[PDB]
Amino acid sequence: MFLTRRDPPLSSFWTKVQYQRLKELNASGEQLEMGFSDALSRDRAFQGIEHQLMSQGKRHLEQLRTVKHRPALLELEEKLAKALHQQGFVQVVTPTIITKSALAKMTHPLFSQVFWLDGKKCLRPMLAPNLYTLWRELERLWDKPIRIFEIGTCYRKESQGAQHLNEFTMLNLTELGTPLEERHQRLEDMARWVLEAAGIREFELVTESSVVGDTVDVMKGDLELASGAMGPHFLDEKWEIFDPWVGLGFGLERLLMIREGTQHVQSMARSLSYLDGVRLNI
């Protein structure tokens, strides 16, 4: 009599809204995948789990108000900057509003992915163009190798990955004048300096290279933590650059999400809904 037409056991799962709530509260993947015998039992369970997550979130915030005095993104930002200053890197801060011409020299499709302000101005989608400019200026006053980096807000109307941030923080460190034979090792050095300062000790370096060049993608498992490029590059011509170089770029909110193992990348980004990884309406 085991024919049974009935449905499998624990077939009632979270409603999309319960699921989203548990995610904002950084529930575990196990908790997110829980099934129940029926809706009432599930709703009941939901309330209990939410309750515990809200409690944990409030405790975390206490730490912020009496101890840290600043959220992870800002703590991470100061942490990364000091570590690079100790390695001789000069930190710069450039315009977040860049021109269409600057943007053009970077490739098209990226034009449809940026927030335009008018026909000639837009919010920078990356830090590269601005650092290219500083390279050209600094190379005329300083001796190579020139080490420069910037940590700052970038904007994109859309992106890859399963999640998206219109406003994100990028760390982009570079060295202009790197000896060709040492390029691959510099990228490694940079990755290590950064990942070490970021409290991440588990990661792998993925190198690829095909036609228009040699790229080094830093990752943890199937998780990308950063992408580095190498010069001479195809674009070097438009920016009047002719020295070898290396550059590595990181998404800090993404780094934080991966290090902390949180659910939403928004949890530690610039926000009015979260603070230091905690959803505020708790």
Instruction: Give 205's Cβ-side CA count (13 Å radius).
Output: 17
Instruction: Determine, following the binding rule CB under 8 A, whether residue 134 of this chain makes contact with a copy of itself.
Output: yes
For a copy of itself, the binding residues in 22-51 under the rule CB under 8 A are: none
Of 35-43, 82-90, 157-165, 176-184, which segment contacts Na ion by CB under 5 A?
157-165
Residue 116 in the binding site for Cl ion (CB under 5 A): yes
The torsion angles phi and psi of 217, rounded to 5 degrees, stand at -95, 115
Compute the least distance from the CB of residue 272 to Cl ion, in Å.
22
Contact residues for 77 (Cβ-Cβ < 8 A; gap 6+): 151, 169, 252
Of 17-25, 36-44, 57-65, 189-197, which segment contacts a copy of itself by CB under 8 A? 57-65
User: Which is nearer to a copy of itself, 78 or 196 (by Cβ)?
Assistant: 78
In the complex, least distance from residue 265 CB atom to Na ion, rounded to whole angstroms: 7
How deeply is 9 buried, as exposed, middle or buried, from its count of CB atoms within 10 A (0-12, 13-18, 19+)? exposed
User: Of Cl ion, a copy of itself, Na ion, none, which one does residue 161 interact with (CB within 5 to 8 Å by kind)?
Assistant: Na ion
Pick from Cl ion, a copy of itself, Na ion, none: which does 166 bind, CB < 5 to 8 A by kind?
a copy of itself
Contacting a copy of itself (CB under 8 A), which of 49, 71, 194, 231? 71
Amino acid identity for residue 138 in this structure: L
> Closest distance between Cl ion and the C-beta of residue 253, in Å?
22
Report the residue number, 117 or 206, with the smaller CB distance to a copy of itself: 117
Please state the closest distance from residue 164 (CB atom) to Na ion, in A: 5
Segment near a copy of itself (CB under 8 A), from 8-16, 66-74, 170-178, 191-199?
A: 66-74
Binding flag, residue 275, a copy of itself (CB under 8 A): yes
Q: What does the per-residue mask of binding to a copy of itself show for 141-170, with x meaning CB under 8 A? A: xx----------x-x----------xx---
Pairing mode, strands 146-155 and 90-91 = parallel
User: Which entry of Na ion, a copy of itself, Cl ion, none binds 134, CB below 5 to 8 A by partner kind?
Assistant: a copy of itself
**Which residues of this chain interact with Na ion, rule CB under 5 A?**
159, 161
**Which residues of this chain interact with Cl ion, rule CB under 5 A?**
116
